[PDB]
Amino acid sequence: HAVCVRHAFKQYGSKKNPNHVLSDLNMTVAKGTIYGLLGASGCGKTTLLSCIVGRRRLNTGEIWVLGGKPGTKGSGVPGKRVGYMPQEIALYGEFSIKETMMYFGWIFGMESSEINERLQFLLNFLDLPSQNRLVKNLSGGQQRRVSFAVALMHDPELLILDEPTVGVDPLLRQSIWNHLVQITKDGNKTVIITTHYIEEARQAHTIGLMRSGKLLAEESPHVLLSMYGCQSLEEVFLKLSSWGKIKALLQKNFLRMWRNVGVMLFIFALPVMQVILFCLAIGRDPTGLKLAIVNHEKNYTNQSYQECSFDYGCKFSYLSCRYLNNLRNSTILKEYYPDPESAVDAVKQGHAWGALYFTENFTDALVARMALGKDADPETLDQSEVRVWLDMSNQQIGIILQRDLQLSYQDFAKDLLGACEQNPDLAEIPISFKEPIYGSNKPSFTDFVAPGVILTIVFFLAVALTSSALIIERMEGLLDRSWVAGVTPGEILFSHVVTQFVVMCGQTALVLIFMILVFGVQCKGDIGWVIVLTILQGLCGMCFGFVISAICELERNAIQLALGSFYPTLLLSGVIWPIEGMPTVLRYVSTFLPLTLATTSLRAMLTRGWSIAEPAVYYGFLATIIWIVAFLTISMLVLRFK
């Protein structure tokens, strides 16, 4: 007895809709006999097969397949001593026919010498095309034959065929049945064909009719028609009463990405281009800001010409074209207007960003204001000033103008004296800013956001790759079919980590190279710890993919969950703005987020040069390691409750 399913109970009930899929089964299959299984549309004939191979655990009862209980330490039924053909196609579209044959042969530990011979024989027998056409390029009716040949490659002693001939030309169905009846001539192998239409399953040695979760007929077809006095079987049925499984599986993972150009460009060429636009468009100070200057001491000749000519040594001549000489030539463009009202009108129409309006007697009232000193009069104070009207609608441009206009005066003051034999330190404010402890006197916004996007690109791209890989391949039956071949769920997960890790050290090597070596983002700290932190953040991201691909079955559902949780963090992690600006009731909450405490640690390791032994640099390692454990605990808990 190859299979005994005596007294098989199985319930899918909910105490509201009790689905008694398997009420009481008494099935027995003898070695060397083809055993058909006819019934309804997968009412109980599609879960009994899964329970035979150990995919689904049985309820109270008995089971005995080949050696003993399925899925035990014998390696009886989940192994190389079985052949499984699923109801649907469970092949890889990006693989050649020969590539698929070798990949499945390596799982069973078959040498490449005999695999080629078996492949050639199978190709000749099943009139398939040459062994160079991809499975995705074959029609839907001839990849079923490829799957059938895959199930027949290793010639096991127990075949579980599920609809082996449904869309097959009967001319090449007579040959299939001849082969099936020939291989079972001796008492070596056995075939279990659970088809759907009765009329073809008549050459089998034994058949079984299944209805309402119970086999109501077991005997041979001839002692069925003779017993029930029937001219056909249809009228009978009218009964109203371990290192080889990781080398050969990593190659598949590294090939399903190379063949898909769209996936390759998304996870390798987007990070490269995104960090190029960011380093070129965000952070740099505005340049080329126009200014409408009114000079009442010179002669108005044109729009972009004033004939600014003063004297240098002493005897201050004009003191208005001299100040404009000290103006910064980088981020200020000067255009001249004839009237104070005309200049203001230009600003109101968006043709400029401000006005200056040096008065008619600025030189006379300025030299007489710094001479008298602290006993001046309101007349000279109100006629020796530059009246600036500014368009302060933009914070970042209203600050550059408000700073370059005052810095240019300090150089002007330090030039007027100093050329008149005086002490330059006299023209200063008592608030003297010494050399900064960290950074430089001219900081950049790019250096503040660059650490914030290193950990964002790496984290998100790991979630997208892991979630899609484990959802598409699970929903297509690739996990279930490969499990029957003996691939325990210990190297399926281990290989994915290795594949994810390798594709991950290549993303870090491109983001860091294109932002530190090129575009010159300062890295004052150790580059050794920067790489480790970036890699560790991603491993937290990959672990998040397991959580996403454990509660969502549909492809579209994981996208909303991934996007609906990422966006909200990243307005709380302080990537684009300092963390200090948030109110101190939500700052505490925002501290326990994934990326918030690692971004701060990476920022302090680049813009300050701190080491690991600093309570702000190692807090970013503990925070990103705890989340790895938390994400690996929720995923296990989810699978337990499902």
Place this chain on the structure above:
Amino acid sequence: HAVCVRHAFKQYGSKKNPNHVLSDLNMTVAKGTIYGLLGASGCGKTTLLSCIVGRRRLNTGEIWVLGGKPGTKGSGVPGKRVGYMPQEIALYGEFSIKETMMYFGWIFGMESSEINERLQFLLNFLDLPSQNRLVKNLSGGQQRRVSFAVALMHDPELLILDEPTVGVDPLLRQSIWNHLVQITKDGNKTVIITTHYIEEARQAHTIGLMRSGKLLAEESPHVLLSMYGCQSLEEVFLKLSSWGKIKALLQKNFLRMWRNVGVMLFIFALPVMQVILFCLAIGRDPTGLKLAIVNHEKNYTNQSYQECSFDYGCKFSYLSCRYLNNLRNSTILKEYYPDPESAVDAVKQGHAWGALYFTENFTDALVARMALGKDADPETLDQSEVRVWLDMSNQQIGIILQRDLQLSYQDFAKDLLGACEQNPDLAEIPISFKEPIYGSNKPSFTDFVAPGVILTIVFFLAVALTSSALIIERMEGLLDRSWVAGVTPGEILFSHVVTQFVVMCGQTALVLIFMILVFGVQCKGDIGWVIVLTILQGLCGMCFGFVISAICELERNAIQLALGSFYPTLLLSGVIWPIEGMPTVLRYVSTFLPLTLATTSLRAMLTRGWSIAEPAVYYGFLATIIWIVAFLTISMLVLRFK
């Protein structure tokens, strides 16, 4: 003669080896007979059914079905005079049996009374559950029965069935075939049953065998056996040699979104919460910064106490505890240290942000510096200054510290003189900033990024909703099955635009109420024009969804394309940084992007109050309208060859 396809011809594929699929098909069906087509591949026969219905087009071949032709307005087949049952389940999820029956009846313009009567009859006859179970909750074998019942509602004169009895028990096939032979008793109706297993082609009236795209046998079953002298058809086969359609289409659209909680939260509850975090975390100036002040005029007692007391009116007492009194109490917290070196290493350890270090003789030297004036000996200049060491690693925080310290000295100077009978105007730099034309002297970053988040939330959510709705519907066969029901492509497009417009009009009033009314973002312009511009961006976003769904056939491919184009555009449209910072060459290209010109128009309409008749404002309407036309041109061009 209901169907005549004499001299049919069809071919497509590669130029070198075209796939001839309907080479010399000669098929003829007479009214009142159950024609039965038997094939092997299952793909060369389905195309014949599609050509018969009218979905496909022949290649130099005569056809005549029902009146004159499929697809014409004279005697067209697609409508209420044909019944289609697709190969796959083309039903709607989250729809009750009764609801889908009513919807498909309304498509055919049938009154509710007859719809209910036919629903009751079909429910009783086909052995289905009560008319309140959602279709997505039914088993695999019951959805097919529901689809068959749907195809039997309007009792037309031609039934194009495709494997209707495949997974039902024999006790039901007998009743189904009895009903099928009863309905075509008189010469009223016709049935074309294209099954796949040759056992139910015995109650038929004219069997047609199909192989290699030809009809090698078209002749009645019994006389076929008599002619070929056998006893089974299997042995014979071994012979190798318009307002009603928009109301129903709109109720369906608003129900497929209300029944899905996940979809509703993503397009309605996401932007409401997104604009709440943004208004609370990004834009606000940092507060709570700490300073390590060293005072050598008082006595060091603790870390948070110095006993700062001085003289108010005249007779300057300390002039160091007085300057600290003018410091801003909001964004600066004061901590005291005993030594200048003990307060500098505090900065190096991250415990503070700066130091002040008022010297021991600050008061005497300060009052002796402003008294002499311009003839001060250099020793007094170097002993009456506040030496500030700043942590300038952060650009944003370092700006406030450099500003709140210098601005506090202006108040200190204006308080020193003014209490000593002097004009405060004496302590002023000649660069005097008048009242700003725009900006109100207090710019905020959150007021610069808020225009541009409205157009980003609306644009992206329109792309995701439209692209993911036309891809799922089309790939499931829902669009094709509704087309056979007479629903023209112009009504599918019009019904989707109306639904999208209502959705984008409901998620626009939420991002505006929650950001302009609640969080007080200034709106100096007209609110009427802002609404139109935001809506115009939604239409532009939706029109981009048509382009993506016209070139992407897989769900996972549209996600990469949508994310692979929105990310670079958002980083080049100047949303989080002024466009003036970009290089001149890259700035020119950026202006041609969809959101680059629209964001600038909205920003000038909120922070400046400009009207429509301004070149900086109406340029955003022309830019966003050209893209609507451009996106509607590429989509039509894509469908030209597809």
